[PDB]
Amino acid sequence: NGAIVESDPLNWGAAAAELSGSHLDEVKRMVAQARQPVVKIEGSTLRVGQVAAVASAKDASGVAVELDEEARPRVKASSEWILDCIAHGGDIYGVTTKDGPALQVELLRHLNAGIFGTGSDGHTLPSEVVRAAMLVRINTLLQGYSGIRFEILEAITKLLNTGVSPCLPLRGTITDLVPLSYIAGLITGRPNAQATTVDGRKVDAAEAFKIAGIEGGFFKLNPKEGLAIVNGTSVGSALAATVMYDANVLAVLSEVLSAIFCEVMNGKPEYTDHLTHKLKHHPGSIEAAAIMEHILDGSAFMKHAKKVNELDLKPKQDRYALRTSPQWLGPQIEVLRAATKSIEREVNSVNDNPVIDVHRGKALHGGNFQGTPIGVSMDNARLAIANIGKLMFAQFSELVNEFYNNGLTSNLAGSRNPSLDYGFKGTEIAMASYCSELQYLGNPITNHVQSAEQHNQDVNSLGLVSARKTAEAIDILKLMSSTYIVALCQAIDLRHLEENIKTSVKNTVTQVAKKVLTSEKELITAIDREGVFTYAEDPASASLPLMTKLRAVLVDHALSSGDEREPSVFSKITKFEEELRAVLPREVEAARVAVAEGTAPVANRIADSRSFPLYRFVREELGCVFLTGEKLKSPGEECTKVFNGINQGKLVDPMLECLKEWDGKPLPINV
Amino acid sequence: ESDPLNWGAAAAELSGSHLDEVKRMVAQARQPVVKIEGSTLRVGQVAAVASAKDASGVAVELDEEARPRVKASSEWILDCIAHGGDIYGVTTGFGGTSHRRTKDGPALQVELLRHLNAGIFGTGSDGHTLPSEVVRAAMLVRINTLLQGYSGIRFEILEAITKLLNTGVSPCLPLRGTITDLVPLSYIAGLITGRPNAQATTVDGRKVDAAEAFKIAGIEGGFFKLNPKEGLAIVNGTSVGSALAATVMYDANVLAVLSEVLSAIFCEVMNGKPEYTDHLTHKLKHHPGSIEAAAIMEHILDGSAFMKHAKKVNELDPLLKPKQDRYALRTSPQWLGPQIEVLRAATKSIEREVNSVNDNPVIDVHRGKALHGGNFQGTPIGVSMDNARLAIANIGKLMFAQFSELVNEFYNNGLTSNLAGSRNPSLDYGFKGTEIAMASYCSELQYLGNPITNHVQSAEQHNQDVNSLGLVSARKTAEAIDILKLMSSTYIVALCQAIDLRHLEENIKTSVKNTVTQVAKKVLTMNPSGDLSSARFSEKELITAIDREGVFTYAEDPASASLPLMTKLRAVLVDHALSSGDAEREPSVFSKITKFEEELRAVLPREVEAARVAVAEGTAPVANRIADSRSFPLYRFVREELGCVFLTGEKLKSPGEECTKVFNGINQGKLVDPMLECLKEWDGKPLPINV
Ligand SMILES: [N+]
């Protein structure tokens, strides 16, 4: 044991130091670790990216688990200390009677209290979580304070690296004796112990040892080794860790997605100005705003939107889902970072009781098994996740609403005829069902603590139960992200189509006017003020805005000045309108065709924007196509492809690619 | 290192211990002047202004150094509007699709206040108004967040609001109506402009109109006519939610320390094993909240006469004591630590918010821009109050578990059932009623642990499709604090009860031992003329038999043959008689036993009763160990300063009367100093583990 740290005796400063860097750098380190093919553990450096790497891998071929051999002496030392103290009399108050081996057998028999159902009707712990738990369980035994044989740690490592996962019940822990006893029960060859192989085949304990390559037969546990395995917070903390990996990734995604939302909405980028957020001090919103500011500062959509600021005073301010999104996301990210550190401390902790302190020569009893950090962190992170989801729902709701999305189509429909294309109306309903259930999951579990086990456990953390609900919350947030991403790419394509149609209408009107009316500048202006999609389905219609406003322009000029006056009216009705009705529908149609074939005169502004890597990922890597009632593809098929892309880890790289040019600093304001 | 995104400055706030953070906070809450300049307002100062009636308790003072930057942004607005415009809520409408344009600036400010006056006041005293303490805190914070010089309001308006604070005139605000704070803040602005419906209350609670409030407050010049930006600058802001959040977090930090201290007193009176606070156990988990909690409890227990005495006892009878301590005692540092971490982060987030610029648009004179944005979104308040409220609920649940162990004779290691104090438990149900009330407190507290921010509604033309609900959440956390004070009060009374019962126990037990040995010498050793080593070696065995039996299982009717004392003493004598060969001395041995019992029965009841009397008179032979313990200031505070007495069915006082005195003391601020005085000798370090 070391000495008291004079400059930081209670460890507040070292925990605060974990939070001193930027969130993005922390996420980048995290994902890089999850991509490493080796996880080497020694009891003090395990991070949530590494737990996620092992949980999503099937065996060593995806990620190999390695024990650090420099941990062997301290592990052995506390194992031998138990054995020597036994030989020369006895002592250990919590470990030692008359039959020692019988006590380790009974310990596991009565903690095997789980209900497995049929094994496949929803009452077993997923093997992904079993694996994560085995990893954390090993890591939290390598500090040398547990009194367990290194050889047991090596055998659990073989289970991880060959993909033999013991079968654990889904429920039964208030945080983790019961689920962990089924790992100890496989290690000891209990007759009811089972496991599954990489390929999903169910096997008994002896077949599991053969498949994993464990030699020497079943282990017979020494007095403290039973408690060392089953007594601990390994299951709750391990699930919490894989959840916090997904949470950090999706928190960054909602920052990027908020910037793309602004691009397709033609929002004013001023809401990201550093001064606004520096004056509130909150680092979460400062980083959120700088991240959006970076994307928007390299956006071709925004250079195009300022060109519209020159010839637009009946405009309206942006809504909160856009204008306050840094203020909204910042506090969620701050909470998620603190929960990550709490969990990362817990997966590097000694949480088995009693503690074997060889330096002072005593077994130290306490409460290191109380997984409060897991339950507190999971409850806090779950509510932050729900607030992130609520923001995506509100942004989604604005984006698909014609009254609010600044010239995009109703429901983001893409077809020539909106009467036979209701676009994302169905996905919008589904987004509300996601959001409602997510708000429900935002409720906490640690205010439902029961007085348990003869009222000996009158407080208990419920860590794993909380972690399970937060994992379900992450699932729903991934559903909302997938559907939102598809809608954003739809919006991008609609802006590309909008721009080319407007260009073709301007050229066409200019041409006909010069040929018939030999004041163009004000005809062009009348076209800017009307949204393309209010007339593009039938541009020649006299009851739609285009023809109605062009007529009104000419009628105004005539009525004011120029009484016959060279038969002014006849030039308006006959030549101009007739000529337009004849040429205009073919020109729009030719613009729609050029867009569809990738040969549009005005290139899609996404190609020149920092947000491009996400559009590319969806359109090229995943093969999702622009959605239109003229074809048969449904939005669910594209949402499903994105969702699976996210689960397989394929969105992380293009998400971070949006920010590859960012120096981690806000844009200067001082002058 | 550089800190471009401000993470390092936020992290540095969470360095240093919680106790030092709390000591600084309590000190600031006691300064008689609070001087604000827009960047140093802390929760101790907000709580000081909120609980003071006027400047005779705590005076608010504006920093004159802020007058130039306040004037610059104000004059910048006036120059720009004179020959220009295009500022939201200045030349344009408010809220959703505010395409409406107007030229009448002053008329626009009048209309802003009229339509934001949307609160329902009820009858004014039936629970639909904001407490005047919260109105004062909101006025302080509103001023502070306008002194950075970015809001375009006149300094003379800030001085007028300051005058309202220092004379104790508080505008009447509605309790509800904000999703976070236009509606409630428009009643401060409306009073500043003399709206016909504006009202306020004086220090003595007199409801007055706007004119009478300017009179009582000494504001000169008549009502204000707001300039274009000045309407928004007052109503746009998170000042109400954040002001209540700040006063809630002052209480939450104090009570978090209390739970740590009471957890140690719980171990003392329970005769728990203090090793659960050993630093190694908590160092190996890294969590700093648990390391500080454990070190705080270790310090109290390292200077406790209860624990020293428990060590000395266990050295002489190394047998016995296998039963382990239950979780509410043994895991209390692991339970509380994560709550303290959460509350510290919540406090720092609230402190940034009460020093933030939360109005729109921002007036940036150095670049000549009116920046529009979303600095009115009070998300830090709603998140911190939802997280803080759940932590408060977990703290309360621990108190309920510790209280439940303490009052149960199966679990409290030799204290009376229900902590009854009477000689006759049959006529003293002790704390049974408080226990039922403790469960009612706990259930409602757990309910309040649920969050509010997962109930956001798409509001105001769907222009406010996300909103923080900061004030609503602060109001629920304020109710959770109230309940936690109810639980803290009742628990403290029970803990002082248990201290006195340990005092009574030791003095009774001492008297039993002395009387038993005296009577065993006269009777069993007078027979040493013909049986020296018959029951001689049993003298130590009689004491051994007395120690293993709970005093209060026989303290009533101590010489009854049906109770454990006489039952065990006989069994000791009889066992030795027919085991040490009764045939060697059969006739005399058993007749001595009968004489021993009758001798004891003649004087033991009087000796036990005389021990009870000496305890109650304060002249007990064995001193109360609380006097030689670091926790003494809390016991002294309850018994001497507040006048709470030992509860017993032989007297007339009811437990609620004593709970109420403690609850009112807590609310009046009287418990902070005794609580901290328990830690006066702590250097902030855990005890060494390398020996
Ligand atoms: N335990």
Ligand SMILES: [N+]
């Ligand atoms: N606003």
